[PDB]
Amino acid sequence: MLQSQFAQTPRLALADTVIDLKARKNLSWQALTDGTGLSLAFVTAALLGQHPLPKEAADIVCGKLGLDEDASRLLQSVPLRGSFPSGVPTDPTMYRFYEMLQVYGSTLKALVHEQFGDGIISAINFKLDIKKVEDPDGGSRAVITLDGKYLPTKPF
Amino acid sequence: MLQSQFAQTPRLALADTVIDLKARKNLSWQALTDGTGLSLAFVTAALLGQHPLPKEAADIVCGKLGLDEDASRLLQSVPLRGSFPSGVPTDPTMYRFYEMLQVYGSTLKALVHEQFGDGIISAINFKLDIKKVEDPDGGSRAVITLDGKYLPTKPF
Amino acid sequence: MLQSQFAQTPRLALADTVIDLKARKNLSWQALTDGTGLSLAFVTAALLGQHPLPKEAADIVCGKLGLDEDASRLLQSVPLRGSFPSGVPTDPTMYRFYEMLQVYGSTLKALVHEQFGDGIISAINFKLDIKKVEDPDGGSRAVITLDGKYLPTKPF
Amino acid sequence: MLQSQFAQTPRLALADTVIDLKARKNLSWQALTDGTGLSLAFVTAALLGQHPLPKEAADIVCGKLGLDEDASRLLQSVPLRGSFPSGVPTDPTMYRFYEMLQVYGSTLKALVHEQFGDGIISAINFKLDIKKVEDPDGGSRAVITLDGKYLPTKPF
Amino acid sequence: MLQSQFAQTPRLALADTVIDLKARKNLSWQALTDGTGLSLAFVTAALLGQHPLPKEAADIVCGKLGLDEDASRLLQSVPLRGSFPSGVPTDPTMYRFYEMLQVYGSTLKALVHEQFGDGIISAINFKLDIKKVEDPDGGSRAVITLDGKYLPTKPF
Amino acid sequence: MLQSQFAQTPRLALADTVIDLKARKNLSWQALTDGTGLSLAFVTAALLGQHPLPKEAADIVCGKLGLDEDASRLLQSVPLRGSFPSGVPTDPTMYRFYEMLQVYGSTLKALVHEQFGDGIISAINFKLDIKKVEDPDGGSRAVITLDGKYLPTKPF
Amino acid sequence: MLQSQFAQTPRLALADTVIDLKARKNLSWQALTDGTGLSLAFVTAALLGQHPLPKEAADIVCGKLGLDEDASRLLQSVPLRGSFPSGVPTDPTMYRFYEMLQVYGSTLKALVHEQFGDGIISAINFKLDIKKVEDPDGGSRAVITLDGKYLPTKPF
Amino acid sequence: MLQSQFAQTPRLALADTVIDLKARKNLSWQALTDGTGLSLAFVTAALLGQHPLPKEAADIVCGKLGLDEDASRLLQSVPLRGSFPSGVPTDPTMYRFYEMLQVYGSTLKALVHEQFGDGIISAINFKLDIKKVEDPDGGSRAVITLDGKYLPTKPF
Amino acid sequence: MLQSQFAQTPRLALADTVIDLKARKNLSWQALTDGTGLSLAFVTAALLGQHPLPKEAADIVCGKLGLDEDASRLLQSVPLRGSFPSGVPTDPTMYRFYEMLQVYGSTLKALVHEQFGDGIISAINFKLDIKKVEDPDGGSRAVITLDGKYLPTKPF
Amino acid sequence: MLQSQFAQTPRLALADTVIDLKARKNLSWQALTDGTGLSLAFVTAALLGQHPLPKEAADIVCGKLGLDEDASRLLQSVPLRGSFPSGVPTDPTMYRFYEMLQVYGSTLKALVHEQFGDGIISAINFKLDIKKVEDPDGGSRAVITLDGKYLPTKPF
Ligand SMILES: [Cl-]
Ligand SMILES: [Cl-]
Ligand SMILES: [Cl-]
Ligand SMILES: [Cl-]
Ligand SMILES: [Cl-]
Ligand SMILES: [Cl-]
Ligand SMILES: [Cl-]
Ligand SMILES: [Cl-]
Ligand SMILES: [Cl-]
């Protein structure tokens, strides 16, 4: 039976505990995802308070971190989502993604309506991934793929 | 001498004109991008006030819309960027991209630091692309690629 | 080719014109919906700047109001939506619906997750209806029906 | 003597305990409502801090959860209401209901004044219910009914 | 058909005109209320954009100010209400009433629930009046009466 | 020596204690006022953190609630006043008074200047009272009297 | 009959005209105050939209600037006061007075309650003066005197 | 070596202790300042978290309050200043000083530039004092003196 | 007599015309500074509304831009300063300077207090310059020098 | 594996400890920087929560303060950066740097586009330095150097 949260505090406190135990055991997010059968972006988001995990995955990650059954039960609950509820990010790393939306937000709207029609690209029927690729200039680039269902607005 | 704007008002008024003339001439954003040698998302963003265009591309787009030499010069100016300066978007289409950042923002930070290191993904050394694909369950999906250079923090 | 707006100013000015002409001609919202084949809530929202109308409906409503082809083209454009972008409403009539959300918002979330699962009730695959009913206590009641698709959040 | 709260902190803390105990005991919101004679939405809202319960109902739900007399006394107090006092929700499930109000808020006002008159649809003399129905595509829909008394504004 | 406003701008502009003409003709608010059969507080609020007037009263006030049929029709339309939509007042005269609410707001809630019960004192089924009385210490006092219907919150 | 607070936290914590003890003893606000010689609204506001009480009254109310000398000393200290410092109220009961000010705020200013002159109605040389009347339409009404000294603004 | 404003726009527009005409005639604020019989701070505040002037003073100031009777009548109206309604000042000169309040605001409250009692120092029964003094260490100092009536808070 | 704070929390907690011990010992702000050789406004501000005290004065006031050497070391640290960081004050006593700036802020700017020139009146090279004077019309007045150095803005 | 502005609108409108005329004549900011005898950063800031220019410099730059005597007089007026009064910048170029303050703001305070003492680094007795330097590792760097007088906070 | 923070709370609590221990041992920021091989501004920012330290440097600074291995591990984690996430600073020392951005922000943008081109000055590839210089007029000045890489916008 699915349980849900009405406030962020319990799952943010669990995320605090994950960050601490992960650092103490010198673990990576990839290591916590290994063996769950789920995607790196989904499992990491769940541990940071933004998704529930299915029971089997929750128990797997909880064993790796040394978390108990109470923690696993909480990880399986549907959270109250939002990773920056208290204002636009000040952190440069997070801010750049907001800046991408500032520069291209109106473009995304315009091109969605041209290429698809009236409606939205879903954030729920939706997958996200990030990959590192080499830049021909020698550096590296992050390629973030947003893959969302088009939901049309139809007259009724 | 490259020129720049100190306020959004002139380029937003020019964007207003573009929207109106594009509708009057029944044009697409793709048609305005055709012949510029630049990508759809970049030219559309420029027309909506978020990038300068080089002189050649500015003159081509202005020719298609019936805009004069003053408009083309304004289009070649460096703008004061930002497509939603007056609050989080209320428009559902733009809001969904903000929601993606709310759910995955902390995950993106965590995975950038794991896969790249301390630093940022650029929003200016940056490419944006939208593809429309078929949805297996019926309908269509948008696959949006954000491609940004990794810039490391420099200890000093 | 479908056209879209990047700012609210043009459609809000058209809505201003609609309000003025509707009053001068002593028309009702029901009369403006009559003959479109569309629902009262959808057509009224479109006229107030929150939806595009298809060409045939746009042409019919503009005929009743005495609006020209430029207005009809604008009415057919996809708007930048949001009926209160400048803060929580002060108007008592609109505020009561906001108050309903303040009192029951956490309940709606909890019961959606219990009866449907993780995910959302859609605001896009969505229909709205308002009915007037006579109250046994004397007077009347409004029965507002929100009818939205459940979109599940699935692990990936 | 009926008692009331002047701050949200105690009832939010009680709601915290309800969420935790219902998860620990594998109870549903419907299970807690059973036997109170009150509607699911009302009892759930009360437990989440937005209504008082009558003594009989409060003792019923507290008995199921293992909460003591101090908790039941607090549940019987009139709360300081508001389920999102610290900003527009970031949670997608809650946000969609806010978005419905952004798109249709001005329409609701217009149609209330046309069909009822000057005045408001009450959020106090008011009932809310949520029903799950099938969608033809094999999924499901939520039909949320808002049923409020019309209170007229009359000259004085 | 009763008409309504969706934006404040037309009625605020009409209020602007009223203020200017009132000053030019050396009129009082009492003089504009005289002959309408309505209360000073209601007619004054209507002229300042916060209520509609019935046709007869609207034509009378409009006659005293020299306003035409267009102004009178607008005065008869249901407004989008709110006399300070852009922040807490800075004006000392209005601010003091806000301060009374800051000092006594929690007291009013506490005493309403004790003397009436759970529910609200209505701002819609509501009358306001201001009286001037001589202060025994010299000077004068304003006695402002707020007279609102108690609307109970009952379980459903 | 009269003492004063620089932060709300201690008196808000004392108010928390008052609410809890009042509920445990099934007391009314009227019972706490009885025997102090002061008005219900003043004593209630003091206990909710918005006024100091004189020593005699502070000792009487503390005796009824079971509060010690430390609580009484704090009740005698001048508070940092303000019953909603963190935003416009979400609670329906408190909000209605704010709405009253939104609708009639500009009217109150206009009528004060007409009937008194330039200046303010005091929130300091000020008395507040709430009375219940059993209204012929069935139910009851609250009659709230705001009684404030007129303080004129004079050239200097 | 004393007239009053409900919006700042007319007096801000008059203030714009004053500033422009003052610059064209190379006048000082002191020259505009000369002959009115009123204080420099009061007349300057009036011209900047924050006080009404008496008829005789309004006429004298209007004659020196070349302003007409419409301007004088508006200058005699009671304004909607507030010189920074749109946020904390960014201007360094005004900001320093705000900073004085940030550093010493809690001290001013504490010392008012110690030296006077519970209550306020009036901003209405109030005089402001600024004086220039030479600094013994070279340069000059501004001595700004705030002179306000103590209004006590008394139990009722 | 001079120490400094980067967050307000420690000095606000110390100010909390000062307020409590001052009340327990029935001391005045004047009594705490007397014997330090410093001005009442400076020492009171320091104790409320807004200035560091020199070692000799810090130990003297700590001796009067019964505070230990840890507290004195904290009182000697340069604070992160600001007595209302969380919004415009709601407290009437503090608010009147803010209202004074709302009414006269633009006047102060205007007269500073006239009597001194471009630049600022300093809030750092600055002294404040408060003086109680008797009012001829019965009662008392506060005379608050702000005394700041003029720092000119010169072209460079 | 030195003149000053009380609102930003005139100088922002003048800045608008500067930007437009500078682009039409294809001028550089350096070209506008040449011949004034003043620094590039000061003259540019003046033209963008943030400083007054001396008469001779104002007349020189106005001659180069084709602005008339009215514009020069406005350029000689002391402005109401602030280049982003309407929120944190969205433009990436301006935002980075804000981001440096976000990252290093607490460090600047700490190191100012250690190296200088209690007090401030002045923004008024202050010079700014920006210089382009080659980066030893490739590309270019901007070196922005902030040169401000230390003003100590001393006890009084 | 590099670790990162998702919330500011742990590194802000460590900064609290650093400040306390630094004062207790009467240390300077320079003494904490000595031996790290890093610059004063970088190490100080790291200790205040704004940068990770390399292991060697983290261990050295922890040895000077009496901090354990948990503190050092935390200092090596990439922080969620931002030294004023809860509003514009009230602290005068910090505020002056914000004020320099208010006065010169548009100038910096303008001159970056003139001297470098379209793009930004980095806050990430960035060095900060403070120098104390004696003022000829008596006293001292801070010469603060901001040294950031120019990052060009890449059209695509
Ligand atoms: Cl969605
Ligand atoms: Cl949706
Ligand atoms: Cl209601
Ligand atoms: Cl109501
Ligand atoms: Cl008052
Ligand atoms: Cl006052
Ligand atoms: Cl200063
Ligand atoms: Cl300064
Ligand atoms: Cl950067």
UniProtKB/TrEMBL annotation, chains A, B, C, D, E, F, G, H, I, J:
Assigned keywords, A-Z: Lyase
Reaction catalysed by this enzyme: cyanate + hydrogencarbonate + 3 H(+) = NH4(+) + 2 CO2
Domain Cyanate lyase C-terminal: start-end pairs: 83-156
Database matches in SMART domains: Cyanate_lyase
Residues the record marks as active site: R96, E99, S122
Alphabetical list of Gene3D superfamilies matching this protein: Cyanate lyase, C-terminal domain, lambda repressor-like DNA-binding domains
Gene Ontology molecular function, alphabetical: cyanate hydratase activity; DNA binding
Superkingdom classification of source: Bacteria
UniProt-listed Enzyme Commission number(s): 4.2.1.104
Lyase listed as a keyword: yes
Pfam family, one: Cyanate_lyase
Function according to Swiss-Prot or TrEMBL: Catalyzes the reaction of cyanate with bicarbonate to produce ammonia and carbon dioxide.
Family: Belongs to the cyanase family.
Name of the protein described by the UniProt record: Cyanate hydratase
Species for this entry: Pseudomonas lactis
Gene: cynS
